[PDB]
Amino acid sequence: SQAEFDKAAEEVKHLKTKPADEEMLFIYSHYKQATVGDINTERPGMLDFKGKAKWDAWNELKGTSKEDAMKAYIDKVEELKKKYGI
């Protein structure tokens, strides 16, 4: 569901506690994979360490269908909702 995806995208922004780095990268990469699809941008330069990490995470999902990405995204948000509370 696209409606379910939009909801999760909003709720994830209001978690009582901010997710761990690993969890944020999972969220970022699946969000991109579900909306844009296969990565279509240039990898950031040497000094942009945070940007390179996010780019690599999304790159790793290449080939994943938007449907599967959406499902994994929503499932993770529900997981984070129960873990950190909202």
Tab-separated table of C-alpha atoms in Angstrom:
chain	number	residue	atom	x	y	z
A	1	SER	CA	0.000	0.000	0.000
A	2	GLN	CA	1.224	3.482	-0.931
A	3	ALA	CA	-0.900	4.983	1.841
A	4	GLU	CA	0.773	2.721	4.401
A	5	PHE	CA	4.172	3.773	3.088
A	6	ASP	CA	3.369	7.471	3.412
A	7	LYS	CA	2.180	6.908	6.982
A	8	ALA	CA	5.334	5.056	8.020
A	9	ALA	CA	7.449	7.781	6.398
A	10	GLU	CA	5.827	10.356	8.665
A	11	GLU	CA	5.752	8.350	11.879
A	12	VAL	CA	9.431	7.450	11.628
A	13	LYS	CA	10.103	11.173	11.978
A	14	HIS	CA	8.436	11.259	15.405
A	15	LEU	CA	10.155	8.439	17.292
A	16	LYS	CA	10.738	9.283	20.958
A	17	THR	CA	14.347	8.103	20.605
A	18	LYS	CA	16.514	8.545	17.509
A	19	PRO	CA	17.487	5.212	15.863
A	20	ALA	CA	21.021	3.826	15.757
A	21	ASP	CA	23.212	4.575	12.732
A	22	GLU	CA	22.666	1.105	11.256
A	23	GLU	CA	18.902	1.530	11.557
A	24	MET	CA	18.924	4.988	9.982
A	25	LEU	CA	20.872	3.674	6.977
A	26	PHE	CA	18.330	0.863	6.582
A	27	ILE	CA	15.529	3.427	6.630
A	28	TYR	CA	17.267	5.790	4.228
A	29	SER	CA	18.206	3.134	1.674
A	30	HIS	CA	14.789	1.477	1.544
A	31	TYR	CA	12.995	4.818	1.334
A	32	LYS	CA	15.044	5.669	-1.780
A	33	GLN	CA	14.634	2.194	-3.300
A	34	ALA	CA	10.850	2.356	-2.851
A	35	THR	CA	10.414	5.839	-4.311
A	36	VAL	CA	13.151	6.379	-6.895
A	37	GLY	CA	14.069	2.750	-7.517
A	38	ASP	CA	17.594	1.665	-8.498
A	39	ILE	CA	20.210	4.231	-7.487
A	40	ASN	CA	20.641	6.863	-10.213
A	41	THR	CA	23.022	9.352	-8.603
A	42	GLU	CA	26.772	9.881	-8.473
A	43	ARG	CA	28.661	8.671	-5.389
A	44	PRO	CA	29.736	11.598	-3.150
A	45	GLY	CA	33.355	12.745	-2.945
A	46	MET	CA	36.130	11.685	-0.559
A	47	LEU	CA	35.342	14.121	2.270
A	48	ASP	CA	31.623	13.387	2.391
A	49	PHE	CA	31.849	10.325	4.647
A	50	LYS	CA	28.189	10.406	5.732
A	51	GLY	CA	27.059	10.854	2.137
A	52	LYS	CA	29.163	7.941	0.914
A	53	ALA	CA	27.703	5.644	3.579
A	54	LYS	CA	24.132	6.522	2.604
A	55	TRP	CA	24.956	6.132	-1.094
A	56	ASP	CA	26.573	2.713	-0.577
A	57	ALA	CA	23.576	1.482	1.440
A	58	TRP	CA	21.170	2.428	-1.353
A	59	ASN	CA	23.511	1.003	-3.990
A	60	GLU	CA	23.477	-2.344	-2.185
A	61	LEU	CA	19.701	-2.588	-2.791
A	62	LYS	CA	20.023	-2.392	-6.582
A	63	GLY	CA	17.629	-4.834	-8.225
A	64	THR	CA	15.091	-4.776	-5.384
A	65	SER	CA	11.521	-4.139	-6.540
A	66	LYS	CA	9.799	-1.029	-5.224
A	67	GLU	CA	7.104	-3.309	-3.788
A	68	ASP	CA	9.599	-5.335	-1.769
A	69	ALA	CA	11.423	-2.180	-0.662
A	70	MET	CA	8.148	-0.629	0.533
A	71	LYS	CA	7.244	-3.748	2.514
A	72	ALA	CA	10.657	-3.908	4.176
A	73	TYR	CA	10.506	-0.172	4.918
A	74	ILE	CA	7.080	-0.261	6.577
A	75	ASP	CA	7.996	-3.389	8.558
A	76	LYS	CA	11.152	-1.754	9.917
A	77	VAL	CA	9.305	1.401	10.968
A	78	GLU	CA	6.789	-0.684	12.914
A	79	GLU	CA	9.758	-2.436	14.524
A	80	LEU	CA	11.338	0.891	15.494
A	81	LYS	CA	7.988	2.192	16.757
A	82	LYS	CA	7.730	-0.606	19.323
A	83	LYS	CA	11.432	-0.449	20.242
A	84	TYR	CA	11.836	3.295	20.815
A	85	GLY	CA	8.170	4.175	21.222
A	86	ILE	CA	6.235	6.984	19.560
